[PDB]
Write a protein that holds these residues in place. Structure first.
Motif, short mmCIF file in Angstrom:
data_model
loop_
_atom_site.label_atom_id
_atom_site.label_comp_id
_atom_site.label_asym_id
_atom_site.label_seq_id
_atom_site.Cartn_x
_atom_site.Cartn_y
_atom_site.Cartn_z
N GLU A 19 -7.68 -1.33 -0.83
CA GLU A 19 -6.77 -0.03 -0.93
C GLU A 19 -7.37 1.28 -0.99
O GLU A 19 -6.86 2.18 -0.71
CB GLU A 19 -6.09 -0.34 -2.44
CG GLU A 19 -4.97 0.81 -2.40
CD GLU A 19 -3.75 0.68 -1.15
OE1 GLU A 19 -2.92 -0.14 -1.54
OE2 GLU A 19 -3.77 1.68 -0.43
N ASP A 20 -8.76 1.42 -1.03
CA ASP A 20 -9.45 2.64 -0.63
C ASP A 20 -9.35 2.92 0.90
O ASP A 20 -9.90 3.98 1.21
CB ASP A 20 -10.93 2.53 -1.26
CG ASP A 20 -10.87 2.68 -2.84
OD1 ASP A 20 -9.71 2.97 -3.37
OD2 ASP A 20 -11.92 2.11 -3.47
N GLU A 21 -9.13 1.98 1.57
CA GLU A 21 -8.79 2.44 3.08
C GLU A 21 -7.68 3.09 3.06
O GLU A 21 -6.70 2.95 2.29
CB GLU A 21 -8.93 1.15 3.99
CG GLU A 21 -10.46 0.53 3.97
CD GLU A 21 -11.43 1.23 3.88
OE1 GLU A 21 -11.64 2.23 4.61
OE2 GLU A 21 -12.54 0.96 3.11
N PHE A 22 -7.42 3.78 4.20
CA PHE A 22 -6.26 4.49 4.62
C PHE A 22 -5.34 3.50 5.81
O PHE A 22 -5.95 3.75 6.81
CB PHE A 22 -6.21 6.08 5.13
CG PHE A 22 -5.10 6.69 5.26
CD1 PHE A 22 -4.17 7.01 4.04
CD2 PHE A 22 -4.72 7.14 6.59
CE1 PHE A 22 -3.04 7.62 4.48
CE2 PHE A 22 -3.41 7.79 6.55
CZ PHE A 22 -2.64 7.87 5.55
N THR A 74 1.00 -1.20 -0.05
CA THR A 74 0.08 0.00 -0.21
C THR A 74 1.09 1.25 0.11
O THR A 74 1.77 1.28 0.55
CB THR A 74 -0.90 0.14 1.25
OG1 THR A 74 -1.58 1.16 1.44
CG2 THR A 74 -0.29 -0.06 2.59
N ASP A 79 -0.14 3.91 1.57
CA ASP A 79 -0.32 4.36 2.60
C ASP A 79 0.69 4.49 3.65
O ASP A 79 0.76 5.41 4.41
CB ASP A 79 -1.74 4.01 3.28
CG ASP A 79 -2.88 4.00 2.13
OD1 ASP A 79 -3.85 3.15 2.49
OD2 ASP A 79 -2.77 4.48 1.18
#
Ligand SMILES: CC(C)[C@H](C(=O)NO)N(CCNC(=O)c1cccc(C(=O)NCCN([C@@H](C(=O)NO)C(C)C)S(=O)(=O)c2ccc(-c3ccccc3)cc2)c1)S(=O)(=O)c1ccc(-c2ccccc2)cc1
Ligand SMILES: [Ca+2]
Ligand SMILES: [Ca+2]
Ligand SMILES: [Ca+2]
Ligand SMILES: [Ca+2]
Ligand SMILES: [Ca+2]
Ligand SMILES: [Ca+2]
Ligand SMILES: [Zn+2]
Ligand SMILES: [Zn+2]
Ligand SMILES: [Zn+2]
Ligand SMILES: [Zn+2]
Lengths: 159, 159
Positions: A95-98, A18, A20
């Motif tokens: 992946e749309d989570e942080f 990720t 992030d």
């Protein structure tokens, strides 16, 4: 029980990272998450960088090839398949989570513990103290412990 | 089958208000939440400010007198009892959550739509599109819709 791994030496591979988090942070969170489960079972987990591992760790968004599409930021955070060949055992993270090393996003460590539980054959717990309870709640990584119900769950599968 | 309401004129009362929002933004969110369900049912909902109501709306934190204590910030958001007298129908929102008219918190409107679903007799749905799917995701109130599954479920309890 449903399915379980019929072996004690289980490999994982981190498919992709990720953006992030730092790559070192991602490795660490994943390694600690497996350690949570190897600490209470006969299982040994080993990271592999080549070849095919039993448990593939994947970051993806939306429709990502498995009939269980992710949903954008929030909502469903992650999913994992029970023990089995192929996609069995694999853990997928939205992946749309942080993803974060601590709080203020979705903590990757905590979620990985939950997901690896699935990868090892656990379902959800009705006990709100259990990491297998299906709601995300941040607890400090240093103070996190599996609950009695978690351990009872996993030890009934693997001794 | 689980219990349902036997009558069609159902009342609710808001027991206390969360300080997180204007008192009237709470009324608005709650009222709109009931409207979602009355639109697809014969049921009608009326707010009363005193006397006994069918659905008592409560904001509480931790243990609050019903054997299902809340867990502080994050995790569990709310819970509601199925139709029946006394505690039946009541909807409890965890005060440790931060309640909002939009996002930047837990949206009260969307959460109330979910809880009222329980108050009216509904269980959870395995369809992620359903509001009775037990996972929170913010969506603008203007764009939110009940899913086919939700409507099917409620229309099969009431006539
Ligand atoms: C889709 C699945 C495959 C997936 C997952 O498991 N991946 O492994 N999700 C879980 C989705 N939920 C379930 O599968 C499930 C199945 C049976 C029962 C339940 C359940 O009861 N969940 C809690 C619902 N709560 C309450 C409730 O139902 N009130 O009515 C009470 C009764 C406990 S809740 O307070 O958390 C709640 C949840 C959603 C709403 C809601 C829904 C729609 C709109 C507005 C609000 C309201 C309250 C959930 S998931 O959400 O990606 C997920 C969830 C948690 C974790 C995790 C856990 C511990 C540590 C770190 C992370 C990881 C992922
Ligand atoms: Ca998501
Ligand atoms: Ca696999
Ligand atoms: Ca991300
Ligand atoms: Ca009541
Ligand atoms: Ca809570
Ligand atoms: Ca609050
Ligand atoms: Zn997937
Ligand atoms: Zn789960
Ligand atoms: Zn309660
Ligand atoms: Zn629910």
């Amino acid at each position: 029980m449903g399915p379980v791994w019929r072996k004690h030496y289980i490999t994982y591979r981190i498919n992709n990272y990720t953006p992030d988090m730092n790559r070192e942070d991602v490795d660490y969170a994943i390694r600690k998450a497996f350690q949570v489960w190897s600490n209470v079972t006969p299982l040994k987990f080993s990271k592999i960088n080549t070849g095919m591992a039993d448990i593939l760790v994947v970051f993806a968004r939306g429709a990502h090839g498995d009939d269980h599409a992710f949903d954008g930021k929030g909502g469903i955070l992650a999913h994992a398949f029970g023990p089995g060949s192929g996609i069995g055992g694999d853990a997928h993270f939205d992946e749309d989570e942080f993803w974060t090393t601590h709080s203020g996003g979705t903590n990757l460590f905590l979620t990985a513990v939950h997901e690896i539980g699935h990868s090892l054959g656990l379902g959800h717990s009705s006990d709100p103290k259990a990491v297998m309870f299906p709601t995300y709640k941040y607890v400090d990584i240093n103070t996190f412990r599996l609950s009695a119900d978690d351990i009872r769950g996993i030890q009934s599968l693997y001794g």
